[PDB]
Design an enzyme around this catalytic site. Structure first.
Site, PDB file in Angstrom:
ATOM      1  N   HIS A  19      23.533  36.498  42.673  1.00 34.41           N
ATOM      2  CA  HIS A  19      22.227  37.305  44.244  1.00 34.41           C
ATOM      3  C   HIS A  19      21.451  37.987  44.004  1.00 34.41           C
ATOM      4  O   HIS A  19      20.763  38.137  42.857  1.00 34.41           O
ATOM      5  CB  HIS A  19      23.849  38.300  44.375  1.00 34.41           C
ATOM      6  N   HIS A  22      21.004  39.899  41.258  1.00 35.05           N
ATOM      7  CA  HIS A  22      20.467  38.951  39.886  1.00 35.05           C
ATOM      8  C   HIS A  22      18.844  39.158  39.539  1.00 35.05           C
ATOM      9  O   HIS A  22      18.053  39.674  38.880  1.00 35.05           O
ATOM     10  CB  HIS A  22      21.618  38.058  39.327  1.00 35.05           C
ATOM     11  N   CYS A 127      48.950  44.420  34.029  1.00 32.24           N
ATOM     12  CA  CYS A 127      49.091  43.333  35.127  1.00 32.24           C
ATOM     13  C   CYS A 127      49.209  41.825  34.128  1.00 32.24           C
ATOM     14  O   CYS A 127      48.803  41.446  33.942  1.00 32.24           O
ATOM     15  CB  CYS A 127      48.001  42.909  35.895  1.00 32.24           C
ATOM     16  N   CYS A 130      47.358  39.347  35.107  1.00 29.86           N
ATOM     17  CA  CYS A 130      46.130  38.965  34.921  1.00 29.86           C
ATOM     18  C   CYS A 130      46.416  38.086  33.153  1.00 29.86           C
ATOM     19  O   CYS A 130      45.008  38.516  33.105  1.00 29.86           O
ATOM     20  CB  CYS A 130      44.802  39.795  35.611  1.00 29.86           C
ATOM     21  N   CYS A 144      47.845  46.583  41.481  1.00 28.32           N
ATOM     22  CA  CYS A 144      46.673  45.331  40.584  1.00 28.32           C
ATOM     23  C   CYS A 144      45.231  44.613  41.447  1.00 28.32           C
ATOM     24  O   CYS A 144      45.822  44.814  43.060  1.00 28.32           O
ATOM     25  CB  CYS A 144      46.785  43.894  40.046  1.00 28.32           C
ATOM     26  N   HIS A 147      45.976  40.883  42.330  1.00 29.98           N
ATOM     27  CA  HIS A 147      47.129  40.420  42.731  1.00 29.98           C
ATOM     28  C   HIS A 147      48.174  41.268  43.736  1.00 29.98           C
ATOM     29  O   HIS A 147      48.840  40.915  44.545  1.00 29.98           O
ATOM     30  CB  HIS A 147      48.141  39.940  41.445  1.00 29.98           C
ATOM     31  N   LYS A 297      25.373  50.130  50.306  1.00 25.04           N
ATOM     32  CA  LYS A 297      24.964  48.920  49.449  1.00 25.04           C
ATOM     33  C   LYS A 297      25.980  48.168  49.815  1.00 25.04           C
ATOM     34  O   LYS A 297      26.726  48.045  51.223  1.00 25.04           O
ATOM     35  CB  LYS A 297      26.567  49.460  48.471  1.00 25.04           C
ATOM     36  N   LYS A 300      30.760  41.798  51.350  1.00 23.32           N
ATOM     37  CA  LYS A 300      30.364  41.313  52.969  1.00 23.32           C
ATOM     38  C   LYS A 300      31.427  41.461  53.962  1.00 23.32           C
ATOM     39  O   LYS A 300      30.972  41.167  55.165  1.00 23.32           O
ATOM     40  CB  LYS A 300      31.432  39.548  51.802  1.00 23.32           C
TER      41      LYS A 300
HETATM   42 ZN    ZN Z   1      46.536  41.022  37.713  1.00 22.72          ZN
END
Ligand code: ZN
EC number: 6.1.1.10
Length: 500
Positions: A19, A22, A127, A130, A144, A147, A297, A300
């Protein structure tokens, strides 16, 4: 032995889509590298990708692909991005490389044998989906962030690094080395960090939980935390131990990063170096955020994301590079927009520089038999030879925008000179005088084109070719007057900076 320059960019999360952020950091590092190469420095410019961790591993399994083959493929996005942007890096390091593994384990051993590593229990919110811990600060409404479901408190055996042991040393080093953390504002931010205890950090997790990465040399059952792993790329790309590259470039290390990763580079990295007995880097140069058009900043959800490749596609590599370097003071949060790039392009490049080249060519055919006239004193324009000396310190102090402004100011001075002297009038009563003024403009363009080469490599070479000037150059050549030779210019030359 005398002039050496080493600059690095952060190695980016291999699975992340390239992006603007970078792109910016990499383009700045490229400008710096290109500039020092032009100024006669033995240069090494490093970039790369962070490819370890369970997240990437998961991604690979998800896509239904072998992890190594997966990172080999997705790392190509960054390599293509750098090719598109014309980044001339010396090495592209990937953390899956064997040499990186050897350096990381060799460094882990030194720190281990030095007594800065112990086995302890890691406890906190976890989590299970995860398969990782989360601080309340990371949870989104206590859930999370991935999730969106509740987390539980779990425990896990981990090896730890006694980072706190080095805080006193680090605080004092930064206090004694005022220019270490470049943009001044970030130095104070780090000194504020070092004010409070930085404690110990987990440097590993069971392979059962994280199977992708570098095993600890004293316990193959554990995998090195990605934070530690990634940072060592700066020395592993130099083959640190015995590598001659390490001996040559490490003493001049300049790290470029976005403020997003200030702590790991200004706090973690220095303590790792001290612990391993490796000299500190010379400078940490902190960049700011590239804000969306609205001044917020980029995100999306805000619909204020600016795609660097869309811009490059429309306006071209050189136009984008020049814009990012000219419009953004390194380290200062700044809004970016297509409209700003367009205006900058039309004003500075298509008009100021491009049109001057085009009408210079036209006038050379009209008043100089289609060739560069015999060299003459620069007079009011001779000052151009002083630009290199003026820009050197600016560039080295990260004031790229000021350096480019001064170079363009000279270009405006060349435009001003022609409209002032009017060779088309001097030609009437005295052609020789008209040819003298023309030579001064051409020699001026040569000098200016050199100074701008690091920002727009291809286009400055093309400019040089358009005037039949020596294409490959050295910054030193911009410090002497009368170097443009009286040779013929190309019968035809495309429009340097075409309308978009
Ligand atoms: Zn998670």
């Amino acid at each position: 032995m005398e002039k050496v320059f080493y600059v690095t960019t952060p190695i980016y999360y291999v699975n992340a889509e390239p992006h603007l952020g970078h792109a910016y950091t990499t383009v700045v590092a490229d400008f710096l590298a290109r500039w020092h190469r032009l100024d006669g420095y033995r240069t090494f410019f490093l970039t790369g990708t962070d490819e370890h961790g369970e997240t990437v591993y998961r991604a690979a399994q998800a896509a239904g692909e072998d992890p190594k083959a997966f990172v080999d493929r997705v790392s190509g996005r960054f390599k293509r991005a750098w090719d598109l942007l014309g980044i001339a890096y010396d090495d592209f390091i990937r953390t899956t490389e064997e040499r990186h593994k050897k350096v990381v384990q060799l460094v882990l051993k030194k720190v281990y044998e030095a007594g800065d590593i112990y086995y302890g229990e890691y406890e906190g919110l976890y989590c299970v989906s995860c398969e990782r811990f989360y601080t309340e600060k990371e949870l989104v409404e206590g859930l999370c962030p991935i999730h969106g479901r509740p987390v539980e408190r779990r425990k896990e055996g981990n090896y730890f690094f006694r980072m706190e042991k080095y805080r006193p040393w680090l605080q004092e080093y930064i206090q004694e080395n005022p220019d270490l953390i470049r943009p001044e504002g970030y130095r104070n931010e780090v000194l504020a960090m070092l004010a409070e205890p930085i404690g110990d950090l987990s440097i590993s997790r069971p392979k059962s939980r994280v199977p992708w990465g570098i095993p600890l040399p004293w316990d193959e059952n554990h995998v090195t935390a990605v934070w530690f792993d990634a940072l060592l790329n700066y020395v592993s790309a130099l083959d640190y131990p015995e590598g001659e590259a390490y001996r040559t470039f490490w003493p001049h290390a300049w790290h470029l990063i976005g403020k997003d990763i200030l702590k790991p580079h200004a706090v973690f990295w220095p303590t790792m170096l001290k612990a391993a007995g490796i000299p500190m880097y010379r400078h940490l140069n902190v960049g700011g955020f590239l804000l969306g058009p609205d001044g917020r900043k980029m995100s999306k959800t805000l619909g204020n994301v600016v795609d660097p490749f869309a811009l490059l596609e429309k306006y071209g590599r050189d136009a984008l590079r020049y814009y990012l370097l000219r419009e953004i003071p390194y380290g200062q949060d700044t809004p970016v927009s297509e409209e700003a790039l367009r205006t900058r392009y039309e004003a500075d490049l298509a008009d100021d520089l491009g049109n001057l080249v085009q009408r210079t060519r036209a006038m050379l055919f009209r008043f100089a038999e289609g060739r560069i006239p015999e060299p003459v004193a620069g007079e009011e324009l001779a000052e151009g030879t002083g630009l290199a000396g003026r820009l050197r310190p600016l560039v080295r102090e990260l004031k790229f925008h000021v350096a480019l402004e001064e170079a363009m100011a000279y270009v405006k001075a060349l435009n001003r000179y022609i409209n002032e002297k009017k060779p088309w009038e001097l030609f009437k009563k005295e052609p020789e005088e008209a040819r003298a003024v023309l030579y001064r403009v051409v020699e001026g363009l040569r000098i200016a084109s050199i100074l701008l080469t690091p920002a727009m490599p291809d286009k400055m070479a093309e400019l040089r070719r358009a005037l039949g000037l020596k294409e490959e150059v050295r910054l030193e050549e911009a410090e002497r007057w009368g170097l443009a030779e009286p040779r013929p210019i190309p019968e035809e030359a495309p429009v340097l900076f075409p309308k978009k």
